[PDB]
Design a protein around this ligand. Sequence first.
Ligand code: M26
Ligand code: M26
Lengths: 304, 304
Amino acid sequence: SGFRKMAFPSGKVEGCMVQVTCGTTTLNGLWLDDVVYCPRHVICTSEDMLNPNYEDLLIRKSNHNFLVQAGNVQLRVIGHSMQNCVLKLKVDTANPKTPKYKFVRIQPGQTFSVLACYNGSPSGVYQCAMRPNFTIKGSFLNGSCGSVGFNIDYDCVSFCYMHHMELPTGVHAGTDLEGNFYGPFVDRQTAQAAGTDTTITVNVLAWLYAAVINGDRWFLNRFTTTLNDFNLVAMKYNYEPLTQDHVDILGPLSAQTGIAVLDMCASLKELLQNGMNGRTILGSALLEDEFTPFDVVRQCSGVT
Amino acid sequence: SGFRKMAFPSGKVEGCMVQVTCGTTTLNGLWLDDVVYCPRHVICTSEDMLNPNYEDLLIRKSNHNFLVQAGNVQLRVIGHSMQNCVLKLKVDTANPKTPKYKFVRIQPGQTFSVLACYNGSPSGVYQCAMRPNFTIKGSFLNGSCGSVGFNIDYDCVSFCYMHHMELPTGVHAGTDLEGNFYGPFVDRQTAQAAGTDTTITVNVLAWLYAAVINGDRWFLNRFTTTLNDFNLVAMKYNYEPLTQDHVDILGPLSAQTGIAVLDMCASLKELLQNGMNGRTILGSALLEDEFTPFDVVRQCSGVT
Ligand SMILES: COC[C@H](NC(=O)C[C@@H]1C(=O)Nc2ccc(F)cc21)c1cccc(Br)c1
Ligand SMILES: COC[C@H](NC(=O)C[C@@H]1C(=O)Nc2ccc(F)cc21)c1cccc(Br)c1
């Protein structure tokens, strides 16, 4: 028993991290096969960031200007190209530690592990969710750009995120591995607003099921609700509307606990309306939304 | 900016995890050099666990009874010995992935990363603290025994914990890598009480400094206190008494923020006495104590 904000083991991703330097800017790159992927803003100076013309900036750069270092060994760059907001630096050596991998674009509300890196070196790993507003609440400092988000299914790493920037609000924005930003963000040092963030309702319910499985049951009540009644409450508390697709994904947890999804919705409704009254659920004094139903089943069943 | 419950990158530890089977029991082992370390209760049947005589049980076991598998390859056991609550299985092959390592006994209040494993395979990684009562609030299911806790300093892994059991209360107990239990626990399926747990005050203050660094400042007040006045409050709220050693360790964070430690203590005092009034600090509605002053500096400076 016990429930923790668990990240995937980061080993397969650590073996892919490299340092990329261009001019005076250093950030992280991801070395898979004979390609190094990194944020295209590696070619910018702090002055360029205010309004960069990436096409014009990249034209003043040659293969030899991109310094790629894997540990203490230098990689030879034989090609460079820009795909959306990422650069693909072709190198002459395939990464011997390349895991089985995929590039995936995750949906908002989905979770992933971030391997925070500096100078091509891993510093830490944590689990987070892609917010409904397509930002992530990460932990990133200067030099962390190019750090990636991922999920692991047995031996396959699905890379879903590459870190690019921190908004003036302190939340984080980045791209998929094809360089497409999640959300309306651009890689420019300009004021950019993330829209209203909402709570990922299906994840809160999944975590309530995890709480019941792990012994925390005080919040269970004698009430039930309907999807429409629940959604009136979800709207008022800036929670994502619950759909039958979400009820269906919660099926396994409903079956395991014997608590019908709409009954768990009524417990959630009462927690939203009355608060926690100074009590905790799984060591938290707020409703946690960064665990998907898949994460709850995985952690509660020991999937390796 | 941003502050997360970050674990160390687990790669160096993943390369050491093996599966150990004895009879019908399977758990995890740690393969370092030519030795595999695992909980000695791998030799028990569920019936033995109620009151095991490990010496007598181990005498009915030979080298060939310990099945050690690293991935899909079998290791040849050439020796076995019990050291406190761990078994050391000597194998004929040194682990080619053995990192630079140390075995350390951590102090209560210190933090470490746990690589949860099942059948010698890593499932997840999370950060936790050794509670003042020498338990950990982990996430462990059947087969997780032998999963280890560790810290990493550049290239050196300091192993500090090996998982052995879950108390009937749902908290976890284990040993250092010499097999010495943290706390009064024994490896027996009997009712065992963990003493009163207290909040790690120096860690809460460190996290309050992390909150100030990352923009969360609402809790700062116009008050100050003394170590004795603060400790009267700490005693009432089951917080560990603050010492000058703790004030000294908080020195760097006090210097970075310009907030004297006793002034941060007065903010903590007011938070203990008044609560949070429905507000949050670093995304938490409770006072977080599983970050040491070292963790705060490391995360806030990007140490890799
Ligand atoms: C180097 O400043 C530029 C800035 N970079 C970050 O926010 C990246 C990084 C971060 O997540 N936090 C943080 C804190 C301190 C830093 F020095 C750097 C960071 C940027 C702004 C707008 C668009 C783009 Br693309 C990049
Ligand atoms: C196999 O039960 C024995 C038990 N093992 C655990 O608690 C280990 C493990 C855990 O942390 N949770 C959990 C949940 C379900 C399990 F089946 C196993 C676990 C034990 C009790 C007393 C002393 C000793 Br040593 C070991």
